Amino acid sequence: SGLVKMSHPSGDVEACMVQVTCGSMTLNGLWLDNTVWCPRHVMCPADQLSDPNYDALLISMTNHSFSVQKHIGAPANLRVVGHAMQGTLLKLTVDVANPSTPAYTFTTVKPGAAFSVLACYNGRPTGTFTVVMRPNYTIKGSFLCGSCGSVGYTKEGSVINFCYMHQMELANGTHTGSAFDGTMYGAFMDKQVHQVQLTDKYCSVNVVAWLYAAILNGCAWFVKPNRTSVVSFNEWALANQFTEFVGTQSVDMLAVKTGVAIEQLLYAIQQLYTGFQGKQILGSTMLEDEFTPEDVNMQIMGVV
Amino acid sequence: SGLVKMSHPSGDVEACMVQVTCGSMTLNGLWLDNTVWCPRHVMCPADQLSDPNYDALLISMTNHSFSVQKHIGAPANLRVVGHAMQGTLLKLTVDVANPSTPAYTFTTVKPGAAFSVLACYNGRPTGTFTVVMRPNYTIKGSFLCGSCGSVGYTKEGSVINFCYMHQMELANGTHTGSAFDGTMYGAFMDKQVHQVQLTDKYCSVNVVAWLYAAILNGCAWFVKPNRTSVVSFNEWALANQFTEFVGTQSVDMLAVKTGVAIEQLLYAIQQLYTGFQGKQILGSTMLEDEFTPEDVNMQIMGVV
Missing domain, CATH: 2.40.10.10 (Trypsin-like serine proteases)
Known part of the structure; x- marks a missing residue:
């Protein structure tokens, strides 16, 4: 666990x-x-x-x-x-x-998706970390002068799917780069000029995965019978700096395993987003959104 | 940044x-x-x-x-x-x-220290992550059946310092293992019996490093002229589930660079530990204690 x-x-x-x-x-x-x-x-x-x-x-x-x-x-x-x-x-x-x-492929990741980054300076790897493509098409990384050309990737078995080549810092701790068709995530220009970003949002489906992860690890105080439908949640989300929720089989696997419906966790989010009022969930006092359903399934249930 | x-x-x-x-x-x-x-x-x-x-x-x-x-x-x-x-x-x-x-050495890490873990199953590496040796001599990792023998290490230039070999899960998300003299961190026995752990505590020096990191990244609302001395803070710490603070040159480098005294950040902690009351620090609403002074110096200021 x-x-x-x-x-x-x-x-x-x-x-x-x-x-x-x-x-x-x-x-x-x-x-x-x-x-x-x-x-x-x-x-x-x-x-x-x-x-x-x-x-x-x-x-x-x-x-x-x-x-x-x-x-x-x-x-x-x-x-x-x-x-x-x-x-x-x-x-x-x-x-x-x-x-x-x-063995490799090239892919373009979408907001909410996680990938590994190998940070490099002068052709020498120095560190690795995982990021999530944010809803405003940036990543929250750790990069200094010399780091451009550092790469990000996912894997499918032994196949490496290259998805990111580092290019720039947009603001404090806020980064972007290219897919390997040469397009910049977020369409930012590779020059040093002022470039506005959209506001960041919570990745709702990752929040839901993390709440399931919390249940699977003995932490379920936030679960109640109350439910919010996906369509109602999504209208709310757009008003409150959350992404619209899209279910997947990976999420369904978590709902089956725990017996807690997605809709119960959507309700919970709506109560929790202003703060947990003294309580904690897996050691956090705010919603965590950089653990994907696939990440939770892999780490906790050993399924790929 | x-x-x-x-x-x-x-x-x-x-x-x-x-x-x-x-x-x-x-x-x-x-x-x-x-x-x-x-x-x-x-x-x-x-x-x-x-x-x-x-x-x-x-x-x-x-x-x-x-x-x-x-x-x-x-x-x-x-x-x-x-x-x-x-x-x-x-x-x-x-x-x-x-x-x-x-090139390698063996070392034993102390509470508050960070190291990398290479998680392995059946002789095959599957993931890597970083942990901090907790004040109760456990680590908060991610390990399943098959993972024993996974190793943890630090590096000094090209030299690898092996410091951890994974052995057991003590409670949900709570792990320990051996140093390479064969001693278990926390002196836990390698058998399946009930074994109590000490309570976890905040690693105060890492909290201080993270607050300096916040200042260096444009986040300094918590800085005031008010000061708490190391000796007074340490008495308080023991009463309130914090480790005693021990300064190092790595921390001093952060104090010089920012012009904010350690003692100002010790005061801040004492105000912040019950909650930030709506505010955030580097996207967190609770004190973060798994970034060391060395980690902050390396990531933000490029110094090793």
Whole structure:
């Protein structure tokens, strides 16, 4: 038992991390097959970061403009034999295939979904943590200068699904990055200008999962017969900084196991959101929304 | 910026994980040099887990009684050529040295200290997370049947300091394990009998670090001129389920950087522990105590 912020083991992804240098900029890249992915702002002069012209920067580059170094294991320089731009990423082609390329896919995560991040500096992994894509298309991470190109991923068995490449800090503790089609989460521009974000909201389905997690761990004082329907809750949610609730089979599995209906927990939320008035739930005194139904099923019931 | 639950990259330790089987029990082991460490309850018959006689079980074993399998990378069976007991661990000697043995040490962590855990099942890493050794010598982890032998570690540069091998669940979400001298944290016995724990307490020095972290991230409403001395706070702490505060250079670095005295934050705690009365600190409405001064210095100020 117990529910904690859990990340995937990072070794498979560590073996794919490299350093990319262009001009007066160095950051991290992802080496899969003969391709190295990295943020395109590696091209920008380090003092021209407000409104860059990336199309103009690209045409001014040649293969010689890039250097790719692997540090992990034993050092190797990876010769660049092609360069292309895809949205806010560069795709560099190198003359050697990564012999440690995992089985992988690319995916785009939606608000409420969790993924692991491997934070890297100068091509060297330094830490890993798990985040949830927020309803305003940011993540609440921990990133400093040097961290761009750090990657986020989920896994399906042994298959790694790469879903995030780190690009920027929008406000204190508030971050975003690219999917591997080169689109920025939240459509934020990769330049240093003021960019407003939507307000953050509670991820209702994750709150419901965490309440089920609390029940499964001996904590159920908040459960009453009273019910709020999904449709009624969702109208309320929009008025009160909660996401609309969408049920899944993963949530249903928790309702069956506990015998507590989703609707009982929707009512509870509506009583609990102004505060627990002295009480605690799994050691917290506010609603927790970064544990997904899949996370709860995996950690507590051992189901994947 | 941003402060999150951060773990070390786990790849170096993944390469040391193996499966150990004895009798009707299988669990995880740690392979360093020619040694494989694992919990000694792998010896116990799966239906004799209340009061085992480990001395008697040991003498009934031979090298043939153990099988060690590596799954990571390409499978290998590691021939056992010696067995010994050290407290609540077995030390198995195998006929091949792990070619991926990291630079390492063994250490024993103290209450308030954080470390990374690599959770493993059947010799296969499944997740990683960070915990803090609690004041009652337990950790708040996430572990199921099959997880024993999972390891915890800190790092000093490239050196891995192994400090925890998982052994048992004491209560819901409440765990303990061995240091590598074979002593159990909290002196809990490796048998299935009722074992009382001391009450948990807030780790005051980590609360202070987190408040400094809040200041560094634009959150400082709780700072006032009022001060409480360390000696006065510590008398109070013992009456109110807080640890006694012990300053360190790591904390001093935070006080200098922010210009806020430790004593101002000790006063704040004394006002905040009954609740924040509607307010929040870095998205929390209760005191957070699992971020250490070193963690805050590393994540926010980039200092190690």
